Every structure is written in structure tokens, then in C-alpha cells.
């Protein structure tokens, strides 16, 4: 949806580093991120992965990059623009919102997993929301895409308040964990999230190493309060089971009867 | 969180001010390094687990300001460190509560990795409890050895040691067994069943461990006694009992 | 031949030009030093054997060896033209003619099982007798199965396969052979268009490069060229590595079979 | 012997010349020091579980062994004549008989699955009864099967195998079994030239040895020797490793037969 970067104009900045362009012919606006190519092995290991999602997406849950420019030894990409911002800290107590927001929120973290890309870092600010008020997945820089449908995840990347137990406590399984298991928790806490309006561990996300394991890894894992409907309590016990094969997938969970609602 | 602490035993001994029952408090600290909080991951996972008669179980956990504090079972005769226990029949009643308790940590896939008589408490009731989880592994399957050279050097195999046959690699079921055989010898003779101190350099003890024949039962014990020492101090670790698999020595039939 | 026989002449751009002073014959020796690193002693090793070993029309002959004040000195076939860096070839049986040799030499080192790892037209050596030669074993590495992953980042990234400039899936393991293949045929297609085929600094930034080859399509043969020279550099320039043709596959192409 | 208060340190040969006071008898004696590294402890327990083991006439045998102060003193049989060093032994009836002394000594050790890895004149010892035994361990490993390989480049250079120079082709990997075979044909055929077989001196540089050793072909008796001798050091220096003789296949070889 451009050509080049004289076509572009910085207006604002935006939320790593992403500006607000404007693409002069046509009076558009874009997101434009820089990826700088420094020279550490598993920085240049994960501009190489975050490059080939970024190019090979296309869905309307996943913000799509139209552009990619080598500016002078660093890479540019020509994003999306999402002008309502994150669902960040966002209270969705209407439950039939919060099913529709979900439903979008699943079509795309589906479409990654199908095409084994693991997001490893679902979190209320990077589901992007706009005008149109429809829901996008954002930030792949911890992301990875995986040779077969069953290839296990070995670092410890993304935000640890969202971390599956079995991404935070290493120890048992050596390190390696189901990637995809680790996205349907991060989203079921964040749509629990929504629900309830605060982070739905009794711990600050902001809190210390042994004070979030302790609330993720040693307790039972949140559960949706009674006063809920049961599809939807029995929707986040379908994304925060502690262990990950009872958890479902992304694409069973579009049948489940808590987002099968519009 | 809101008992009053008492005594220092760091481990405090608290007294919970409405029920005016005693408990045993450990802290636990969250630190920067993997080694180190994954030791945290082993150690506050086996706490909770734990529900076995010989075994220390835990009651509640706490976080203050990022540091957990555990509150254990407060056990009322202190350690068996020091202790002489020369008759049989109350020596197999003691083993036998102790292998119990450690035949229920090995088939959890639970190592201890530092049993010794620091670590096996007693209270008023003459009954014994498996204590220090701080060096604890648990296991994914039932062979999955061990690499790390952590514990307490006197009373630690010869192959947790003597690495290098194995690449550190050593059977973590056994390492303990060998620990229990050396803990239970030296209830019998008052000593450390080794030639020198426990608290020597690391070469002499490495000597001591690794290179002479293992410790025996004195002629002077019945042959269930020698035969059972013998059974926890083998050189080469597959030829080592597990922990159920002495239970029917018939030493422990001594019991009661 | 004595190292005190033998004396510099002219540099090759670090290499010299030796002529024998009793024979009266042009020779290039290069110098191989003992650093007390220990993974400059496994290339030494790695380098001096590959060196020894070789015997083929199409790859650069060692003829002696000299131990000389704790370095190592290895006597080199001259080669009177240089190298075919900046090459064009325009006729197609030139290039054929050009492109068996090369294929003849790599063909025999991947058989010895040596990966090149630095094919590009820097390093393939022409003469009077217009014989092309392959020539920089630095980086080169011999293998012990027919197949066996090479781990180290090594070469020039412009010349390199995707798979060793991406290092994602195979996680830094790579087929060396197949690396080699890709390297030819870049080289080969450069022969042709007269260019870089890879629309970025051949001297560029890491970023550049790695968008130029991992992340757009690898380059094709123009369509006014042959459908023979069009179909043999898709055969080099498969990006699954597995879909490129052997060496010794590639000298049956009907492309190859021009050079009469 | 009983205690270190018995001993009184006579020479030096760190290893000590000591003498028992009470029975007269001279013995040697070794100090090793607890080191803080890893792996200086992985060599210490592998050197003394070595000492320990052994039985028999032509290796170096530990009467006692004792510890005081975080120092382990190993007692050894004192050795009064010292090394084969720099023997210029040609006798092709004399050599057979020290040849089969060294094949004795190294054929105990391999099939009892340790490798020496410095066998060199200076390391094989002559005493005044001249019986012949290996002697220095610093380097030697015990190993888990028959068919387990060795992982660390130490020892002398100058007496190394190809293979334990040439470290990239197998990984770092080698068969010390038949690279202490090489060790002792190196020595075998130094005792009867008189000079270090190769065409360098052993002190030179790296790049020196290498080229020499690695990258000429290996050395041959002269065919003025003996078929039998010439034959033999065949056995011991194929560049191939497994072209190697084992060392108990060489004590019926028809030179040690003499």
C-alpha cells in the first residue's frame, strides 16, 4: 500500500519503536517499525523469524504489513495502522462483547498456530482494537515458526505475567515447552482479564520473579468467578488448565458454546 | 502471616497466636540466576506435594515482598545428628520409618540428595521425618539421571564425586540409598563410619569415600544388620537396593 | 625445491608469486601461520591436508610443503590470468564450457566429501590455457559421512545459500554440499547477466543481504537466455536446500552437455 | 609402611626419592595438591583410582598411599637407575627383550581399560635388577567399555598420535588405546636409531611437529634392519588407526619372541 519511503511523513510516535506515517498521495495513515541489524547471533536469529511472519501474514486478526524498506542497513515495515489503540487494561463485563471480541481474538491466533507460528507473547496490549472496532494480533518479536506441528519451544522468551507454569517452572520437561499450549493460556488469561478488569492472579504483574511463579506455577489456575455463565467459566477452564494437553487449541475452541455467540 | 516468631532454630520456630500451636518457618528468596530459581521451582513444588507420615509436610506458604516464607511442621526432639542407637530392634524401627518416607519420595520421582542425620528429625512422639528439600530434583521419568554435584560432600556416593566415570551423570535413587546406608552405620557405632572427619579437605574425604571398599557392619551386629549395610553401600550403584526394595530386608522386620 | 631456492617476485593482492630460480618456473606460495588459538590449529589441520590430498585437472594442485621458522609454506600452482571475479560470459557454449570445469572440480571434492564454503568467482583461478581451477581451501572443511550438518558460520554472505545466512530451523546445522551448489550457481548466473544477481551491495550490510537472498525468491535466468541455461541455475538455486541438484547431477544438465 | 614421619626425603626426581627409615628400603614419593577447578579434581580421582589398581612386574605399583593437610603423598617403588631416556640400545636380541617387558606392562593396562597417553622414554623407568616399568599417570584416563574414546588433547606433542593432533576430522574424538600403540612404536624405534625417528627435534614448534608427523608419511625401520624389527615398527606406526596392532596381539609378534 506504498512504494517508498518518500511517499511517507512521521506525524506522532506510537506505544520497541513504531511511528505514525502518513502516505502523501493518498492521505492514509500506517504504522512504520524499525528492526535494526546489530550483530548478536539470536538478535539476527529473531529478525530473520520476525521478517518471514511479518511478510507471509494474511488475515483480519493478524496486522498485516503492506511495506518492508533496507533504509540504510535497517529494516523498515509498512504496518497497519490500529487507531483505537490496545485492549489494554480494558473492562469487557458485557459478556456478549467480550465473546465477539474473542471469537476475532481466536480466528487469528487459529490462522498462526495452523501455519506453526507460536506468538509467545498474547497480552492484552499487543490485541490492537480500531475504528471499525475489530481486534488484531500485533507484536511477532518474540515469535517463532517451527518445522513440523509438533516441535517443541526451547526459550524463554515474552512477558513473564502471562507465561504458562510450564513456560515459567523449566525444571521437569528440560526447557522445552508446547508453544501453542503457551498462547491459548496467554489468551485465557487476558479474556479472564477483560472479565474481570484487573490481572486475574493475586499477584502485581509488575511484582517480583518468586512472587508471580508462585501465583502461576503453585496455585490452581484462575477460574471465572460464579456469578459468570457457565459457558463462559467453562471457557477460560478450557485455556487455563495448568497441564497443557487438557488445554484446547485455538481452532477448537472457535466451537466452543461460549464464542459461538454474536 | 500475622503469628508471632519465637525461637531461632535460618529456620525460626513460631507459635500461632489463636491456636497457640507450634510450626517450624523457613524463607525461601527469590533471586536473579536460573540455577538458583529453579532450585526455588524444586525445592516449593516437593513442599506442597509432600503428605507422607515421614515426611516434614508443610502447612501454608506466604509471599512477603518477593521473598516465600514456608511454614513446616515444628518436630519436637530436634535432629538425629550426634545420635548412638545401638540396639537392633529400635534401630530397624528407625530405619524403618525412614526408608518409608523415602520409598514414597523416590516413586514420586523425588531425590533428596542430602539425607543424612542433620536432616532426619524426631519429636516427643519417637517418630521420624525426611527434612532439607533444598538440593531436591524432581525427576521426569523413573531412570533420568542426575548431573549435579550438589549435597554434602561426607555422606554423597562415591559417584557423585568420582564424575568422571559417567560424565557427572549418577542414579539419583541410589545416591540417596548410599547417603541412608552411611546415616544408618553411624547410628550403630556413635561415628562417621569413614576414617576421617566429615568436616576434612575435599581430597581426604575423596580417599576416604571413593577408594577404599565401603563401610561394614561391625561382626560383632547380627547378620541382618551386616547384610543390610551392605545392601545401601555397594560401590557400583545398580547393585544398591531402592528404597522400597529394603523394606522387606528382614532387619526391618525387627521392627516392632 | 628449497624455500631458500625459491624467491617473491610480485603479491597477489595475503599470497605471493614465487619463481623457481634453478627451474626458472612461475609458482605461488602461501604462507600458513601457527597461532596459539587452538581453533586456528584445527583449520591449519583441516586446510594442509585438503591441500595435500587434491589431485584434479579443475582444482589447485599443491606441489610442496615447507616447514620454515614454525611456518608452514605451501608451493601453489600458478595460474596466469588471475580469477574470473567480474566475469561476463555472453556465449552460452563459453559459459557451458566454463560452468563443466567447475562443476568437474566441485564434483570431485564433494565425492573426497570436502565442502568449499566459499565458492564465488574471486576464487575460481583461470590460466593461459584457459582451465578453470577452484582455489581457496580457508574455510573449507572435509567431512566424515556423505552426508554429516557443518555448524560454522564461514565465507562471504553474498555468495552464501539462505540456509547459512538464516540459521532458524536447522538451527544453524546445514547440507555443506547443497551450500556449495547454490554458491556455484549464483557465481554461474553472475557469469551471465554480467552483474551481482542479487539486486544489493555485494560489500553490504547484513540486513540488505539477508532480504535480498533469504526473504525475496532466488534469482532466475533472463528469459532472451536459453530454456537449458534457464532450467540448470533453478537446479543451483532451489531455496530448500534438498531440491538442489548434486554437483555431479548437474554435469548430466542439458546445459552442460553444450560445451561438445 | 605406616606413617609420612617415616620417611626422610633424600633427591629429587613434584616426585621425591625417600628412604624408610626403619627397614632401609627406598621407595618414591609424589605430592598432588588439591586444586579449586573441576576438572584438575577430575584428573586427580582418575590418577590415584589408577595407582591403586595395578598388578604387575613392568608398571610402577603403590606399596601405601596417605593424606595429611589436603595432600595426597602416593608411596611408589623407587626406581634407581632412572628413564630409557636418550638410549641408544641397537642389539636387535637386547631391545626384543626390553619389547617384551613394555608389551607386558602396556597389555595389563589396556585390557584392564586405561590409557596411558605419555608413553615416552622418560616415562618408561629401569631399576638396578634392569626390569623395565611405566611410570608417570598425570595424563592416563580409565575408561567405561572396551569401545569408549577419549575427548581431551593432553600429553607430549612429540610422541602424539596423528590422530590426537589432527583433532577436527572425528571431533576432537581418537582411540587412545591404539594411540598409546603409536606412543610405544615411537619409543621402540627411537631406542634402536638412537634419535627421535622423525626429521624434527621434539622441542620444536607446533606447526614444526605437525608437518612432520600428521602430514609425512610415518617412519619404517631402515631395510638393513631386521624383517622381523622392520615388521615390527609396521605394526605399531600405521598413519590408519586401526592398522595399529593391539599391544597383546605384539607380545606374540616374532621380534618380542626374541
Same mark, same amino acid.
Not at 539476527?44 to 511478510?55: D, G, P
Not at 494480533?137 to 515469535?143: N, P
Not at 484487573?198 to 520473579?209: H, L
Not at 490452581?220 to 457457565?230: C, D, L, R, V, Y
Given at each position: 500500500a506504498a512504494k517508498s519511503l518518500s511517499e511517507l511523513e512521521r506525524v506522532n510516535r506510537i506505544g520497541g519503536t513504531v511511528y505514525k506515517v502518513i502516505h502523501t498521495p493518498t492521505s492514509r495513515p500506517f504504522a512504520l517499525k524499525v528492526i535494526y541489524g546489530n550483530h548478536e547471533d539470536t538478535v539476527?536469529?529473531?529478525?530473520?523469524?520476525?521478517?518471514?511472519?511479518?511478510?507471509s501474514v494474511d488475515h483480519p486478526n493478524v496486522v498485516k504489513c503492506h511495506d518492508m524498506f533496507d533504509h540504510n542497513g535497517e529494516i523498515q515495515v509498512?504496518?497497519?495502522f490500529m487507531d483505537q489503540g490496545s485492549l489494554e487494561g480494558a473492562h469487557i463485563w458485557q459478556e456478549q462483547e467480550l465473546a465477539d471480541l474473542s471469537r476475532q481474538i481466536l480466528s487469528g491466533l487459529a490462522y498462526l498456530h495452523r501455519r506453526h507460528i507460536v506468538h509467545r507473547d498474547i497480552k492484552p496490549s499487543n490485541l490492537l482494537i480500531n475504528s471499525?472496532?475489530?481486534v488484531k494480533?500485533?507484536?511477532?518479536?518474540?515469535?517463532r515458526i517451527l518445522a513440523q506441528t509438533m516441535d517443541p519451544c526451547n526459550s524463554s522468551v515474552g512477558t513473564i505475567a502471562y507465561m504458562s507454569p510450564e513456560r515459567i517452572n523449566t525444571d521437569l520437561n528440560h526447557g522445552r515447552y508446547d508453544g501453542y499450549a503457551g498462547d491459548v493460556w496467554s489468551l485465557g488469561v487476558s479474556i479472564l482479564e477483560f472479565y474481570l478488569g484487573?490481572?486475574?492472579?493475586?499477584?502485581?504483574?509488575?511484582?517480583?520473579?518468586a512472587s508471580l511463579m508462585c501465583a502461576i506455577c503453585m *496455585? %490452581?489456575?484462575?477460574?471465572?468467578?460464579?456469578?459468570? *455463565? %457457565?459457558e463462559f467459566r467453562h471457557f477460560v477452564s478450557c485455556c487455563l488448565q495448568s497441564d497443557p494437553p487438557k488445554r484446547?487449541?485455538?481452532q477448537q475452541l472457535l466451537q466452543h458454546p461460549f464464542?459461538?455467540?454474536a
Open positions: 539476527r536469529r529473531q529478525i530473520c523469524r520476525e521478517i518471514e511472519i511479518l511478510r509498512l504496518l497497519e471499525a472496532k475489530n494480533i500485533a507484536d511477532f518479536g518474540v515469535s484487573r490481572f486475574p492472579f493475586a499477584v502485581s504483574r509488575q511484582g517480583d520473579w *496455585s %490452581q489456575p484462575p477460574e471465572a468467578p460464579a456469578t459468570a *455463565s %457457565q484446547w487449541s485455538a464464542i459461538l455467540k
